[PDB]
Amino acid sequence: VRLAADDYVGFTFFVGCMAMMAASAFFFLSMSSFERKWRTSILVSGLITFIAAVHYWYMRDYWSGFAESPVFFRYVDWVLTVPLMCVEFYLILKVAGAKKSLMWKLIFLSVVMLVTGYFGEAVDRGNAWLWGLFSGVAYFWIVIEIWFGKAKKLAVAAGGDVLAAHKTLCWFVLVGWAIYPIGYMAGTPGWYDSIFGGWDLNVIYNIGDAINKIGFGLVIYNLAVQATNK
Amino acid sequence: VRLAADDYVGFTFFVGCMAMMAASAFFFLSMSSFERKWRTSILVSGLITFIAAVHYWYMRDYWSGFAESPVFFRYVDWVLTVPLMCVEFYLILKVAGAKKSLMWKLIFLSVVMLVTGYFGEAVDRGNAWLWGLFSGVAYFWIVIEIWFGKAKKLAVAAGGDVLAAHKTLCWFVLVGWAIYPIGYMAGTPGWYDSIFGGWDLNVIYNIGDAINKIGFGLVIYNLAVQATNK
Amino acid sequence: VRLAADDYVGFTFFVGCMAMMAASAFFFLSMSSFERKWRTSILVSGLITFIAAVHYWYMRDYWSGFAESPVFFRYVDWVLTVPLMCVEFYLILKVAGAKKSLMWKLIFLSVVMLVTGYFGEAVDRGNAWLWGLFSGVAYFWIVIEIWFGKAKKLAVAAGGDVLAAHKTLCWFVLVGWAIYPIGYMAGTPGWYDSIFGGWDLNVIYNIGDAINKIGFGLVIYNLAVQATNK
Amino acid sequence: VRLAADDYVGFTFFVGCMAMMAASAFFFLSMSSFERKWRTSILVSGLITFIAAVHYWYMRDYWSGFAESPVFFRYVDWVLTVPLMCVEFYLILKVAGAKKSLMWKLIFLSVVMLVTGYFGEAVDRGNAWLWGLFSGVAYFWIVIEIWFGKAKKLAVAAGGDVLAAHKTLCWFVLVGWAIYPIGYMAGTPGWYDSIFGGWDLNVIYNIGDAINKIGFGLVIYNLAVQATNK
Amino acid sequence: VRLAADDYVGFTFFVGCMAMMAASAFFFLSMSSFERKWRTSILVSGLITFIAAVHYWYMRDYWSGFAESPVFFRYVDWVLTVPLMCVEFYLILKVAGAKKSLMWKLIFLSVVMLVTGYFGEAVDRGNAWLWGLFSGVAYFWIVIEIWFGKAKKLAVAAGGDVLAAHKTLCWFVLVGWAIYPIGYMAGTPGWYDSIFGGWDLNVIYNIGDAINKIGFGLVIYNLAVQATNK
Ligand SMILES: CC1=C(/C=C/C(C)=C/C=C/C(C)=C/C=C/C=C(C)/C=C/C=C(C)/C=C/C2=C(C)C[C@H](O)CC2(C)C)C(C)(C)C[C@@H](O)C1
Ligand SMILES: CC1=C(/C=C/C(C)=C/C=C\C(C)=C\C=C\C=C(C)\C=C\C=C(C)\C=C\C2=C(C)C[C@H](O)CC2(C)C)C(C)(C)C[C@@H](O)C1
Ligand SMILES: CC1=C(/C=C/C(C)=C\C=C/C(C)=C/C=C/C=C(C)/C=C/C=C(C)/C=C/C2=C(C)C[C@H](O)CC2(C)C)C(C)(C)C[C@@H](O)C1
Ligand SMILES: CC1=C(\C=C/C(C)=C/C=C/C(C)=C/C=C/C=C(C)/C=C/C=C(C)/C=C/C2=C(C)C[C@H](O)CC2(C)C)C(C)(C)C[C@@H](O)C1
């Protein structure tokens, strides 16, 4: 329980936990300052930070206890949050004429991706590469859908601020999420051990997680503010 | 109390606890995002997830402590929630002209069913089969009421979206709940030696619980959203 | 702190604690769906469940710790709640032309009753019968006031649903509360034995408490709903 | 950690903690039931109970642990709350037009009083009587200000219910607070040991505290209710 | 874990924690009594106190445990809060025609300052002076920006109460914050050991922190108050 000055992992847990708790409060308490239709999109963003805050709190204690943060445990959060973020694609293009078919697709993809991930990392480590492959494919499909699929066409039709915030999402998916597949390579045996192996990811996980989720949130909030002021 | 990767029960407690906590927040915070008439129906759906979240949190810790989740302890939650879900039949058809008699019936049935269950499982295990039988009968009665009784006739009279959402609820009762009677068979000795597959009932309980209750919620919420936008 | 199936006291603490927490949420979150005048009556009903929920949580832990629930400790809750329920008489007859004098009387009576009770049970057990007697007298006074006193006359003058809900309250006072004086008889030495074998007082306390308080709540809520819809 | 029936200090901590938590909820949840300008006055009353509830909870645990409640520790609460109560003078006479000069004065006086108190009781007990003297002077100043100073003149100018509630506050300051100076006399050596010495105030502290702060609250709330109905 | 009367650090943690928790409640609960536009500025001020309250709670326990408060641990809070205060410049000049470029600048500067601080104090103590220097420069830049830079000119252009509140903030930055750089000097070896060395700042940190943050809050709140009374 004693703190050390050089414990940079410790620090990043405490910061992340605190920043997620603050963000969660910030979206929950901002909900009320918006027009009827936007609220739900904010609300869900809050949820996302909220689940993370509560899980981070747990992890923050665990690391202080045992000085080890097992990667699979993160999945507890990811399997819940990653889908919600996908749902956030529906809420942005709902005004543009998005169909529940898209919703279902996204959720399906996101869940499969995270379950396959979890199987690769926890359940079946011998055959982890294949699970990786499946998850990879589900990721690519999601990234292709959002970049060149129906979602982009709907966004371009809508145009304006709605388009912009879409793109930034896609960047966050493309660049922000990329760190997670990489960490898998460093986590599981296979043909990618040489390229990525032995890297300390905890700090990168703690910073990235907070950035990713708070980032999404701040985008959707930016979209709401730019839509009310004009 | 360090966690292990292969502890799939552990994982499902943490996920279920987090998903129930999120849903509870989601309905509590969405309650205000509808007109006054729907609110109570949402509110109660939230309550359902809320009671589950708080109980799951307790169970989640217990399993982490002693690595055993006694089945009777689940009843703490079920005796409270199963009635509320039944109440949810009344709240949908209240605008269609439902009578409190129906509500009282449902509550009565649901309570008896769960108490009989609890007697079968906790106090009197030798004569568990009879209690089973009584609970069974209470189940059947409720399924007959909702499928062919006055509830569906009132829904059809109202007609449209109110009907649709009703049916899906009946499916959730019919198919969703079916896992609970089965687990009883696997729990008590008698004329049923029902043990099916290598799957651990705890895991099925943790996933099912969350599905069932989050399911309910999503349906009621879907009904409210499709009724307000038009 | 492992639970047993046969620990029926345990079970009733966990259920009671959970049901009180749910009810407290249910009144707090329903408060806002009413006209300005009703709110306070609901709010206070919630407060009542709220104090109980928080105390029950403490008792629930204690019993899990030491497997003994000292009766005097319940008073911590009762001395706070029993007065509020009395206030609930004032809040429903306030529109009928109740005077604050009545409210003060009620509070006074209820406090004296509970303090005398606490003196009987905690400070001097040798003199417990006399304290009993005094508490008894305060009970009778309250029951006579509400059944045949000014409160009934004001309710009958008002008439309608406001009257009805009054009666049911009086039943809850008359029948619901009766279990508490009985338990005293079983708790303290004197001229009364009140064996009441078989049933465990704790269990009757846990179920009764929840019934009494949730009951009150449901009544006041029923009154508000039946008065607002017309 | 085991409870005793004869532990009247224990009891009063648990009651006080619970009653403060209830009141805090009661003002927070009632805040919305008033016109905009009363809200702040309620809010602050709640804050007062809230800080007390949280400190009482801490003290309640401590006493259960070590069976001793050091008087200086209470100051943690008093230094925060006593100023807020003073602010409550400003918020009631905002109708008739009080000047921030009065606000600042009150806060200044109250803080000095409490700091001098803390110095008398914590750092230098040899020099305690002088600190007493200084605190005394700050008290007297406050009591004379509110009884015969500008505050009374403003209240009389305003007249009506606003005046009434003022007086009762002055009584609470005059009579309610008087127990605190006395306790000092019983706590520290000096020239007042003879008059007041060896007295145990814990029980009197626990009851008084709750009375004083819940009292203020009930007054401000009474003022708001009597000002909206007319 | 028993506390002593002369433990002034202890006392200041408990007061700070309590005062921050109260303030956080006070802004969150006041938020709704304002027009749409001001809310966000209050909200964020509350967030600031909120993060501090939760971190102070942790620190408060730590000191009670180990009787030592490591300086680097404070950074957990500062790295989150110091930026938000800077953002508070944007929210007050937003209606005056502030550009997000200014907000980004401020955040950038504040983050750099705090990171450089953290590097100086945690990871690289040998080269702490250079990090100091860099942080210093980031501070100076911020102070010159707010005193003579774009921010001041924008505030003067939109004079009145918005200007006043600006100045006071600058004072709080100039004078309030100054104690943090000083503490660095007392913490790290270099050319400033002679001037500042061996000083105990814990008590000064705890009082300053609460003043600084509650101060900010009270200013923004004051600005909102004198903006509604037209
Ligand atoms: C897990 C696994 C796999 C999966 C692999 C995956 C999913 C690989 C993914 C690779 C990725 C995502 C590569 C990313 C490349 C580049 C990145 C991350 C960043 C580029 C640019 C940056 C950082 C910033 C760009 C800009 C910003 C900041 C915004 C501006 O608007 C535009 C610009 C200046 C360009 C298989 C399927 C291949 C095999 C299996 O056995 C193992
Ligand atoms: C899954 C699904 C479908 C279903 C399709 C089909 C073809 C389903 C066909 C049949 C199914 C799923 C039947 C499941 C039945 C389960 C039941 C009726 C379980 C009842 C258990 C009871 C009443 C146990 C009672 C007892 C107990 C607990 C202990 C006693 O000692 C003994 C006894 C009285 C037997 C679609 C395709 C239609 C729609 C889609 O949305 C959902
Ligand atoms: C109150 C009042 C007044 C009087 C005010 C007085 C007497 C004083 C006011 C302010 C004072 C004394 C402020 C002092 C501020 C000190 C600061 C901001 C110090 C900053 C230090 C830094 C940034 C150090 C950085 C470094 C570090 C940390 C390590 C590196 O290695 C070296 C260095 C770069 C120097 C008037 C007369 C002006 C106006 C009247 O209206 C009111
Ligand atoms: C008569 C009737 C019916 C049929 C039956 C009903 C409703 C019966 C219900 C009876 C019940 C629930 C009676 C319960 C009574 C409990 C009482 C009066 C308990 C009082 C206890 C006290 C006051 C104890 C005090 C003392 C204590 C605690 C210690 C002291 O040392 C001694 C003493 C003063 C006695 C219906 C339902 C058909 C219609 C209805 O309108 C009327």
Ligand SMILES: CC1=C(\C=C/C(C)=C\C=C\C(C)=C/C=C/C=C(C)/C=C/C=C(C)/C=C/C2=C(C)C[C@H](O)CC2(C)C)C(C)(C)C[C@@H](O)C1
């Ligand atoms: C009959 C009647 C009533 C009842 C009571 C009446 C009229 C009076 C009651 C007086 C009471 C209850 C209290 C009097 C209080 C005296 C106080 C507050 C004394 C304060 C003393 C201080 C502050 C001492 C400080 C010092 C310290 C701390 C130690 C130093 O070394 C020396 C010193 C400076 C003296 C009412 C209230 C119902 C109203 C009306 O109906 C008339």
Ligand SMILES: *C/C=C(C)/C=C/C=C(C)/C=C/C1=C(C)CCCC1(C)C
């Ligand atoms: C807030 C939580 C976030 C954004 C987490 C994201 C995680 C991923 C997108 C994971 C992707 C994976 C693959 C595509 C390949 C390897 C396994 C996974 C599950 C890490």
Ligand SMILES: *C/C=C(C)/C=C/C=C(C)/C=C/C1=C(C)CCCC1(C)C
């Ligand atoms: C979240 C809680 C839920 C949905 C629990 C559902 C539980 C049941 C519907 C239990 C039913 C039972 C029978 C119909 C027969 C055997 C005994 C029971 C209690 C398991």
Ligand SMILES: *C/C=C(C)/C=C/C=C(C)/C=C/C1=C(C)CCCC1(C)C
């Ligand atoms: C929420 C809990 C409730 C309603 C408890 C109520 C308890 C009473 C009305 C107790 C009355 C007593 C007497 C009339 C005689 C003996 C002492 C008491 C306090 C048990």
Ligand SMILES: *C/C=C(C)/C=C/C=C(C)/C=C/C1=C(C)CCCC1(C)C
């Ligand atoms: C709930 C907290 C309350 C109402 C505390 C009030 C305390 C006082 C007004 C204390 C006054 C004192 C003096 C005038 C002299 C001796 C020292 C003090 C601080 C106890």
Ligand SMILES: *C/C=C(C)/C=C/C=C(C)/C=C/C1=C(C)CCCC1(C)C
């Ligand atoms: C909530 C606490 C606050 C406002 C703290 C702010 C502290 C700073 C602005 C101090 C920064 C420092 C320097 C300019 C020089 C030395 C290193 C720092 C980070 C302590």
Ligand SMILES: CCCCCCCCCCCCCCCC
């Ligand atoms: C550290 C986590 C929380 C960070 C929250 C950032 C503060 C929000 C800044 C922009 C707010 C714009 C308000 C728009 C409505 C007028």
Ligand SMILES: CCCCCCCCCCCCCCCC
């Ligand atoms: C462990 C470090 C936590 C880092 C917390 C700060 C997160 C801030 C995220 C903001 C980045 C995206 C901004 C969106 C652009 C409008």
Ligand SMILES: CCCCCCCCCCCCCCCC
């Ligand atoms: C939308 C959220 C979905 C969350 C799905 C959680 C799945 C967890 C699976 C746990 C292990 C399954 C059995 C392992 C092999 C016996």
Ligand SMILES: CCCCCCCCCCCCCCCC
């Ligand atoms: C332990 C694993 C728990 C996983 C729970 C995931 C949340 C369930 C989502 C709801 C599923 C039914 C959808 C009904 C559509 C109206």
Ligand SMILES: CCCCCCCCCCCCCCCC
């Ligand atoms: C006003 C229209 C709102 C439509 C929203 C539909 C999607 C909502 C999904 C969020 C529910 C998440 C449940 C908790 C996590 C398992």
Ligand SMILES: CCCCCCCCCCCCCCCC
């Ligand atoms: C909404 C109704 C909930 C009712 C909960 C059940 C309470 C009774 C449980 C059984 C108590 C122990 C009985 C022991 C008999 C010897």
Ligand SMILES: CCCCCCCCCCCCCCCC
């Ligand atoms: C606007 C009026 C709506 C009335 C709806 C009927 C009320 C039924 C709610 C039942 C709540 C049960 C709470 C149980 C707590 C354990």
Ligand SMILES: CCCCCCCCCCCCCCCC
């Ligand atoms: C272990 C105790 C479980 C008790 C659960 C009680 C649930 C609420 C009961 C409500 C009583 C009926 C009130 C009807 C008012 C119109």
Ligand SMILES: CCCCCCCCCCCCCCCC
């Ligand atoms: C309306 C609320 C009234 C609350 C009454 C609280 C009861 C206080 C009991 C105090 C008993 C102290 C021990 C006995 C004397 C040594």
Ligand SMILES: CCCCCCCCCCCCCCCC
């Ligand atoms: C609009 C009419 C309001 C009437 C309020 C009567 C008193 C309110 C209940 C008691 C206050 C809370 C007590 C908390 C426990 C000490």
